[PDB]
Amino acid sequence: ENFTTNLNQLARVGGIDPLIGREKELERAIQVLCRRRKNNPLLVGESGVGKTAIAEGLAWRIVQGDVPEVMADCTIYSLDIGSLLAGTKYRGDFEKRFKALLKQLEQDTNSILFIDEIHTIINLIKPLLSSGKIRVIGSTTYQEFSNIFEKDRALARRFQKIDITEPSIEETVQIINGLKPKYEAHHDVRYTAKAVRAAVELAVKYINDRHLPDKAIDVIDEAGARARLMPVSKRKKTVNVADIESVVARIARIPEKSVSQSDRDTLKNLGDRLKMLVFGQDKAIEALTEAIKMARAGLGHEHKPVGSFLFAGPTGVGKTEVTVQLSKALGIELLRFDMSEYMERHTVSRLIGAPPGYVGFDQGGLLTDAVIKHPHAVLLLDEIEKAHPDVFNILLQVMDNGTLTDNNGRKADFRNVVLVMTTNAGVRETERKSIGLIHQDNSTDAMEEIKKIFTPEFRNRLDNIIWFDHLSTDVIHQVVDKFIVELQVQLDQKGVSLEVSQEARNWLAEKGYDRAMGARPMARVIQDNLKKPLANELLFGSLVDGGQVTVALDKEKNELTYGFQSA
Amino acid sequence: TENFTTNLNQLARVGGIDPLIGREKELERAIQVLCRRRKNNPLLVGESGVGKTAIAEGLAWRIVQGDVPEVMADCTIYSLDIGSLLAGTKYRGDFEKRFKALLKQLEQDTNSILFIDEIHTIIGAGAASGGQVDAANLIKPLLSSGKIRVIGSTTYQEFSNIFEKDRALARRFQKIDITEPSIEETVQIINGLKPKYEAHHDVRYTAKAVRAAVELAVKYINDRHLPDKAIDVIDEAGARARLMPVSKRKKTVNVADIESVVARIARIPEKSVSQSDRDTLKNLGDRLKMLVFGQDKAIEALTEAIKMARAGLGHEHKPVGSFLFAGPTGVGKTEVTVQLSKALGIELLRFDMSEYMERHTVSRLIGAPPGYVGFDQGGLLTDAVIKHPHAVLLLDEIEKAHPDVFNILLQVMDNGTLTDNNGRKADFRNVVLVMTTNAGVRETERKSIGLIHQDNSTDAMEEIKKIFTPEFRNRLDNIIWFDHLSTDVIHQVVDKFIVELQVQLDQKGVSLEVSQEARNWLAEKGYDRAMGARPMARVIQDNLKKPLANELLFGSLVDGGQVTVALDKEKNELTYGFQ
Amino acid sequence: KTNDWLDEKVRDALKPPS
Ligand SMILES: Nc1ncnc2c1ncn2[C@@H]1O[C@H](COP(=O)(O)OP(=O)(O)OP(O)(O)=S)[C@@H](O)[C@H]1O
Ligand SMILES: Nc1ncnc2c1ncn2[C@@H]1O[C@H](COP(=O)(O)OP(=O)(O)O)[C@@H](O)[C@H]1O
Numbered sequence A: 001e002n003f004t005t006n007l008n009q010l011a012r013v014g015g016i017d018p019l020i021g022r023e024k025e026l027e028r029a030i031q032v033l034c035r036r037r038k039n040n041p042l043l044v045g046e047s048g049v050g051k052t053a054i055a056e057g058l059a060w061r062i063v064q065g066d067v068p069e070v071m072a073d074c075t076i077y078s079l080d081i082g083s084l085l086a087g088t089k090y091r092g093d094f095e096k097r098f099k100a101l102l103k104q105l106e107q108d109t110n111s112i113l114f115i116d117e118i119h120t121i122i123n124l125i126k127p128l129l130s131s132g133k134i135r136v137i138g139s140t141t142y143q144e145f146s147n148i149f150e151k152d153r154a155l156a157r158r159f160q161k162i163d164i165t166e167p168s169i170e171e172t173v174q175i176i177n178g179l180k181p182k183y184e185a186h187h188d189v190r191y192t193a194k195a196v197r198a199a200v201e202l203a204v205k206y207i208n209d210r211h212l213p214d215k216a217i218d219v220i221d222e223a224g225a226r227a228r229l230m231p232v233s234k235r236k237k238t239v240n241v242a243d244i245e246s247v248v249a250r251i252a253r254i255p256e257k258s259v260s261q262s263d264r265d266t267l268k269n270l271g272d273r274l275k276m277l278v279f280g281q282d283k284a285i286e287a288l289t290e291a292i293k294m295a296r297a298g299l300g301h302e303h304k305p306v307g308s309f310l311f312a313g314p315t316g317v318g319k320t321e322v323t324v325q326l327s328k329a330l331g332i333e334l335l336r337f338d339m340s341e342y343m344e345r346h347t348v349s350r351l352i353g354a355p356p357g358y359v360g361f362d363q364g365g366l367l368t369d370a371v372i373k374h375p376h377a378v379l380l381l382d383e384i385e386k387a388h389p390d391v392f393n394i395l396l397q398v399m400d401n402g403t404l405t406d407n408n409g410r411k412a413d414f415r416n417v418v419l420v421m422t423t424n425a426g427v428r429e430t431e432r433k434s435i436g437l438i439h440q441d442n443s444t445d446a447m448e449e450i451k452k453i454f455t456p457e458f459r460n461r462l463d464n465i466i467w468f469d470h471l472s473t474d475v476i477h478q479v480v481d482k483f484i485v486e487l488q489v490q491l492d493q494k495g496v497s498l499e500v501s502q503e504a505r506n507w508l509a510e511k512g513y514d515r516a517m518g519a520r521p522m523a524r525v526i527q528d529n530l531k532k533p534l535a536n537e538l539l540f541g542s543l544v545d546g547g548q549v550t551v552a553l554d555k556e557k558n559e560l561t562y563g564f565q566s567a
Numbered sequence B: 001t002e003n004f005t006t007n008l009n010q011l012a013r014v015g016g017i018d019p020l021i022g023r024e025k026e027l028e029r030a031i032q033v034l035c036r037r038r039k040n041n042p043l044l045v046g047e048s049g050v051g052k053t054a055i056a057e058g059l060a061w062r063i064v065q066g067d068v069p070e071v072m073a074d075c076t077i078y079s080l081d082i083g084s085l086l087a088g089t090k091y092r093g094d095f096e097k098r099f100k101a102l103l104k105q106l107e108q109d110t111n112s113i114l115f116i117d118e119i120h121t122i123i124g125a126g127a128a129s130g131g132q133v134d135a136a137n138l139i140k141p142l143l144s145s146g147k148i149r150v151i152g153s154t155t156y157q158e159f160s161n162i163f164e165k166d167r168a169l170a171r172r173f174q175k176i177d178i179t180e181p182s183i184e185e186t187v188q189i190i191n192g193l194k195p196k197y198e199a200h201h202d203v204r205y206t207a208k209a210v211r212a213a214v215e216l217a218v219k220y221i222n223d224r225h226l227p228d229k230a231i232d233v234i235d236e237a238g239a240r241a242r243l244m245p246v247s248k249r250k251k252t253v254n255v256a257d258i259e260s261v262v263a264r265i266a267r268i269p270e271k272s273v274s275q276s277d278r279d280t281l282k283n284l285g286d287r288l289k290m291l292v293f294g295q296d297k298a299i300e301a302l303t304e305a306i307k308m309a310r311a312g313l314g315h316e317h318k319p320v321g322s323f324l325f326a327g328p329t330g331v332g333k334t335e336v337t338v339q340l341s342k343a344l345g346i347e348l349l350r351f352d353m354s355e356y357m358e359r360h361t362v363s364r365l366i367g368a369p370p371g372y373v374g375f376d377q378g379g380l381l382t383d384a385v386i387k388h389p390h391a392v393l394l395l396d397e398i399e400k401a402h403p404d405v406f407n408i409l410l411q412v413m414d415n416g417t418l419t420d421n422n423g424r425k426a427d428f429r430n431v432v433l434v435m436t437t438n439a440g441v442r443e444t445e446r447k448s449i450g451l452i453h454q455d456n457s458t459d460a461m462e463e464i465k466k467i468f469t470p471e472f473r474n475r476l477d478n479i480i481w482f483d484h485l486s487t488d489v490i491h492q493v494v495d496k497f498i499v500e501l502q503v504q505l506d507q508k509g510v511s512l513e514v515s516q517e518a519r520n521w522l523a524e525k526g527y528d529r530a531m532g533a534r535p536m537a538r539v540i541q542d543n544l545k546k547p548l549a550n551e552l553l554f555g556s557l558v559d560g561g562q563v564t565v566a567l568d569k570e571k572n573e574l575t576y577g578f579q
Numbered sequence C: 001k002t003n004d005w006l007d008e009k010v011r012d013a014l015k016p017p018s
């Protein structure tokens, strides 16, 4: 009694919440219990799916009487793992306590024991099952079932697998609606029907953390607590959809704008936002917006991925910038996998294999699990030309069916992820000089390179070939100013003030920036040129105090001249 | 000792122990071993659910009824519980004192015999972890001396690896092989256990019902062995029969209920096992005509083969049907496979043979052998068929497959089984194997070189013979050729495509009307002779779906729900009107 | 491409009551 509480008796007095739905799942649980042998139900599931609640809901049904006569008198007791284990801290002392508890249940016929999180415990579990005097309910995670139940033949034979699947979107809101009267009575304030339905959709799309149904129940209670606690509750007797989103911000860790509904609103601002931080190449961003626009409208196959993008040109063509901004604008975690490392059998196995350890089974496919970890996260691929043709074939499979299957058996859905690729074929051909007495430009069309490097089917499945325009000199000058501004703000904290001449910015721009390497060398060029000379003075010299710095160039020698003042 | 040890003979008198049926040969071997002066410890080794435990328990029941030899009579069988004995010791000498106490009781009574289920556990770690004073060492002198007799139960896999490693313990015991003699004994065995099961569920099992249960589980339920699975399905059927009588309904268990029970264990659609869906099979061909058309032989050949399988005339060990489709790409060879699974409501298994273009790739489908990186990962083909025993297996571009892949298919078609690295037997006779090839079209489509043309009637068949080895062709039930799509069929394909687009828009709330002339224009550009109807999906996707989607989000479609499609004669480009 | 597979009781003292 003390070690294990009585759920059936508890439900008779109250506390247990009535279970709505799950009629088919509960029906099967009743069926196995009525069996002469192998009558130990196993509510396999995931955290938050309601498997524990199903046990509590089953106990309520028995007292209510919605069960066969044989099961009407049965009593479900939930074994407390913490109570028995706590206070002993010894091997075999815990078992002695379990023997006494088991004896009490064995003495009383038609007694049901519920071992929540049974995998944690799993010596005495096998004997009670083999005897068959008392049937036992066990809740274990799907991952733990394979690790423990499947490996042990005896445990698997006695326990019957009952598949507990998460309810659909419509089902999840219905569960909240069924349980909404209880909540409203508890705090005396109600939620609008639009708000509860919206909570399910907004929670899963942004938080993506515990469970589809669990997040809905947790998000509704969190919203009511904030609104009721606030003094405005007297004036505000209903919960607005935005109010939940504002409360959801606390458990989101992102601004309210991201949580705010932007299915159609993001389209207009996202186009402007890309241009706000990126100068020029409006056509390139328009191609990206057009492909994702199709998914929001919804006039497409559900399995087909959200969007397909492509990038060409030299390294550092804003692939990281546009992707980071695109991910930020869409409020999706940025996931980037580099094909540059996938050039060997061991490395190429990484997409669907577990390079960290063969013993390790949880990670499985690193690229595949990344999608599973974040359903909406964007996938950024770079230097795909390097990768072997065989690896590229698997990409074609997911693009067609919009789904993948891991070696471990996990299934990943690409219906919610946009796939973008980056290619740098142009730099290799253009830099080469023609083999002739008089040289000729070796620049070639980017589309030509995509066709030769990749198979025709890839282009056919791909919605369109997107070529990003090359960087402009005006942008490079602005980029130089940004780095100086970044360096400038860093110096202001220490108390040093740096002033750079306009001619100095142009001077660094010509030598630093390269056509083949884009803006990558300019970044490095600004660090060594400016940080190194001041660094010596900052430690010891004129810049130790005051921090007065001037930057200028000498036209006669074409070398930068640095002036240091003690100040 | 009473807590740890339960008296089977005393329990048998009260009940609990089920009556043993048809194990005279197995039991006789056990008595001979028990009567031996030394090493009188019979060991029962067999597969899971073979009545291994029942044989030992049954001996007690037989002794209670006095149906055993006189020497065996006046004996007691004790079932030792290893788990209870190990639990609660929490000291170095607690296990030894209780174990020695138990042995003393058996030693005092010469007639008494002990039964240790899963005896392999004691040899691994019987008493202590990290110490060599195990339970087996304690009983090794006693078993050799013959003071106490111990019966054991172990699985073949457990007996080979965990047990028999220590020769000292193994020699003392006497291996007794236990195997299910036949399927007829199982139904006979269930009859003996029928009163106990019937009483628990308050149901009655018909003679036809009991026989049907064992047969259905054998073919469909491969998770467990024949005796246990057969008992399981009849046991579950009682539970189904318990739920239905809300108020004075029939309690009899019907074959239909048992058919549903086996379906739940295998999670199959339940249509194949039941014969009530003969109407759907009767009209399977007619339904397919609404689906991909233009090949009277493909639909007729495939539908006829499925019908004989349900009728009981299908191959006993080979797959339901083996067919090779040789025709131009894009003529519906692939669609017949995916249009038959949806109609039949069964899973679709598709493998890309093009990926398996090298010798090393074949190991992926069957798995890597022991001691290699891929042993942990099961074969792709074996995992898929085991996971989905009843499904449609689709192999595309079989001709491009490495010769090694073809060899694997030979055993699949001839024997209906494939063994993976783990050694499990994958039985997927229910699946219908269909392969699609594009080799034949090249010879027939191309005209013979020279001034005077030559007949191409046999060129298509010659190509099949060259590309496919004769042994492979023998296993194939039939080879069907797909004729080129006629102009009417190509136009019909567009009509289905617009209907699909119209149906998709109807759910969204938008109504689409396409001009008849516009359909003809789409057909010519979308359909290509060499590529068949493959580009039609892309043309419809890019041309029509992309513009409509823009207006759906914002525009005329969101406010008005109307759209139209037209063609511009001057520009020869489709024009869409949004309202 | 071979792979290698790598692979409670204490005495107590008693105190009589004083
Ligand atoms: N008789 C037909 N009636 C209707 N559609 C047809 C017919 N024949 C071919 N098609 C269509 O042709 C397209 C391709 O046919 P398949 O036999 O699947 O060839 P495929 O090369 O596998 O095609 P993909 O997957 O589109 S590259 C599909 O849209 C089919 O529905
Ligand atoms: N289908 C459902 N019907 C009702 N409540 C549910 C359902 N699924 C989950 N819940 C809720 O889940 C909460 C926690 O129970 P559960 O999810 O079983 O816990 P755990 O995550 O520990 O397994 C309960 O408050 C219950 O109301």
Ligand SMILES: Nc1ncnc2c1ncn2[C@@H]1O[C@H](COP(=O)(O)OP(=O)(O)O)[C@@H](O)[C@H]1O
Residues within 6 Å of the ligand: B018, B019, B020, B021, B022, B023, B047, B048, B049, B050, B051, B052, B053, B054, B189, B193, B227, B228, B231
């Ligand atoms: N010959 C038989 N006579 C009677 N019942 C049998 C016989 N064979 C099997 N059974 C029934 O099926 C069960 C088979 O399971 P069992 O052999 O005990 O499994 P395991 O070997 O995995 O411990 C028996 O316990 C009994 O209920």
